[PDB]
Amino acid sequence: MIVTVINQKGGVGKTTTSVNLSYYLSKEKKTGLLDLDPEGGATISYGMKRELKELPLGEKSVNIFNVEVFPAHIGLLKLELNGDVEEISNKIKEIGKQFDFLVIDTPPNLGTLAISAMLVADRIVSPVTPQPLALEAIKNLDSRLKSIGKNAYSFTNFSKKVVKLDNLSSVKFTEITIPPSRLFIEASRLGVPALRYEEVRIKKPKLANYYQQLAKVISE
Amino acid sequence: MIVTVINQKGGVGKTTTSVNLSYYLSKEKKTGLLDLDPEGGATISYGMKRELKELPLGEKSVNIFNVEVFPAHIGLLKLELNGDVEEISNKIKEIGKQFDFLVIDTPPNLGTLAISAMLVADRIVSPVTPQPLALEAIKNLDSRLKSIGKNAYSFTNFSKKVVKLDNLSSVKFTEITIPPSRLFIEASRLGVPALRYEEVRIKKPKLANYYQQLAKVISE
Ligand SMILES: Nc1ncnc2c1ncn2[C@@H]1O[C@H](COP(=O)(O)OP(=O)(O)NP(=O)(O)O)[C@@H](O)[C@H]1O
Ligand SMILES: Nc1ncnc2c1ncn2[C@@H]1O[C@H](COP(=O)(O)OP(=O)(O)NP(=O)(O)O)[C@@H](O)[C@H]1O
Ligand SMILES: [Mg+2]
Ligand SMILES: [Mg+2]
Ligand SMILES: [Mg+2]
Ligand SMILES: [Mg+2]
C-alpha cells in the first residue's frame, strides 16, 4: 500500500504526518518512508542529513527506528526540474513493491515529484489547518483531484476542533484533529518520531490515537 | 585522534561512553563512531540494527545525529577469530585518518577486534564501576596494557564517588565520576545518545559536563 502525503501549502504538517504514520505502521508491517522533498524534512526528522550526491530514486536507504527511510538527496532537485512523470511514477511503484506500506513525504509544491507520488498513491492523505492558505490549498486539491477523479483523506492539524469545508466531494474530511503540542517540536528537535519520543516523554501517550485513527480510516 | 573505549567486564558503560563522547565531539569536530561489538550496542543507541551481512570492516556507515556511525555487523564475528591483528590495525588507522575523532566501542572481552583497537588507539578510556568484579577487570586491564606498551585513562560510572587504585601504573585514575541517572535508561529506550535526549528534555542540560571533562582530560 502506497500512502502519499500531499499539501501544496508549506508548514501544514506533511513531514510530521509521514514520519509518525510510517513509524506507527512499522510496528507490525514492513514499512518504508520515501523523502521526496529535496529539503529533506523527513530525513532530518529521522536524524539524518540530505545526501549531497545525485542518487537515483530509491537507491540509498537506512533502517532507523524500524522504518526504512530513503533519505532526501540533491538528485531529487534534477527530477524536480527535468524529471519525467511516467518514469518517476514507475520507479516509485517498483520501490513500493518491497513494503506493506510506503509512506511518501512530498514537497510543498505541485512539482514533478509531488504529482508522481500523488498519481501512484493508493491512499492520498492531506492535512488541513485553520490557516487561510491551507483552506485555499484543500479546495485546490479538491478541484485538481476531481479532474483525474482521485480521492484524498483530509485530517486537521494545529487545532483542537476539526476543520471541514463544504462542497468538496473528492476530499473526505475525517474527524481526526491534532492539537498544538510541543511534543512535536521537541521530537523534531531531537530528530526522532514524535510517536517514539512520546513513549518515554509522558506517562500516558496521546498521539498514538491520531495515527491509529489515520491508519484505520485509510486501510484497505 | 583515535579514542578506544575498553572494558572486559560487561555492562560497565562502554557503549554509553562511546555513544555520548562521540556525540559530544561531533558538536565541534568531524567525528566517527566504530562499533566493534558484534552485539551492536552503539548501533542500537543510534537507532539502528546490526547488519545481517558479513561486511568488510568499515564499509557501511550512516550519519546519525551528526555522527558517522559504522554499524556493527555479523562480519565482525569472523574477524574476532581469524582477523589478522596487523591487518585490522591498519584498517582501523585507514578508517580513522578521515576523522578528527574516531570513537571505538569494543565488546566485553579481550579478543582480536578489541586488542587491535587498543593497539592503534591514541587514547584509551576505561569506565570502572564500584562493583567487586569491576576492580578485578581494571586490574587485569593494567596487565593487558603493559603487555602492549599502552596506558589508559579511567573514570567512574554509576557512582557519586570516584574509584581509584594505587597499585596500577598503566591506568591513570581521573576524578571523573558519572552518577546513576535515569536519563541514560530513557535514552536507550528511545535509541538515541543520552546527550541529545537531555539537550531536548530539560531546561539546563547537565550530562555534558562529564563528557567535557573526559574530552579535556584525554586531549591534553
Ligand atoms: N500538531 C502540532 N503541534 C505543534 N507543532 C507541530 C504540530 N505538527 C507539526 N508541528 C511542527 O511544525 C513544524 C512544521 O511541520 P512539518 O511537518 O515540517 O510541515 P511540512 O508540511 O512538512 N513543512 P514543508 O515540508 O516545508 O511543507 C515542525 O517543526 C513540526 O514539528
Ligand atoms: N550512569 C548511568 N546511570 C544509569 N544507567 C546507566 C549509566 N551508565 C550506563 N547506564 C545504562 O547501563 C546499561 C549498560 O551500559 P552499556 O553502556 O551498554 O555498557 P556496556 O559495557 O557497553 N555493555 P556490554 O557491551 O555488554 O559490555 C545501558 O542500558 C545504559 O543506558
Ligand atoms: Mg516536509
Ligand atoms: Mg538494510
Ligand atoms: Mg557495549
Ligand atoms: Mg555519507
Side-chain angles (χ1 to χ4, degrees), chain A residues 85-121:
Chain A
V85 166
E86 174 176 344
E87 303 168 22
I88 307 152
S89 291
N90 290 343
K91 195 47 180 298
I92 292 165
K93 283 179 267 199
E94 298 281 308
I95 292 155
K97 293 203 147 78
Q98 302 285 129
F99 305 100
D100 302 319
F101 291 98
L102 180 65
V103 187
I104 307 185
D105 194 5
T106 64
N109 57 58
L110 312 161
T112 311
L113 301 172
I115 299 303
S116 312
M118 183 267 314
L119 292 170
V120 296

Side-chain angles (χ1 to χ4, degrees), chain B residues 121-158:
Chain B
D122 299 304
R123 298 274 182 290
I124 288 163
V125 160
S126 185
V128 76
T129 69
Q131 283 297 342
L133 277 301
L135 281 301
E136 298 311 309
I138 192 70
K139 196 281 172 194
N140 204 228
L141 175 66
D142 198 81
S143 280
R144 272 164 72 208
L145 286 182
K146 293 178 159 63
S147 69
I148 67 166
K150 275 315 200 77
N151 85 39
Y153 290 56
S154 174
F155 72 96
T156 301
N157 196 35
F158 288 113

Side-chain angles (χ1 to χ4, degrees), chain B residues 108-127:
Chain B
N109 60 32
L110 67 161
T112 301
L113 282 184
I115 210 70
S116 303
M118 302 209 83
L119 280 168
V120 292
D122 299 304
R123 298 274 182 290
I124 288 163
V125 160
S126 185

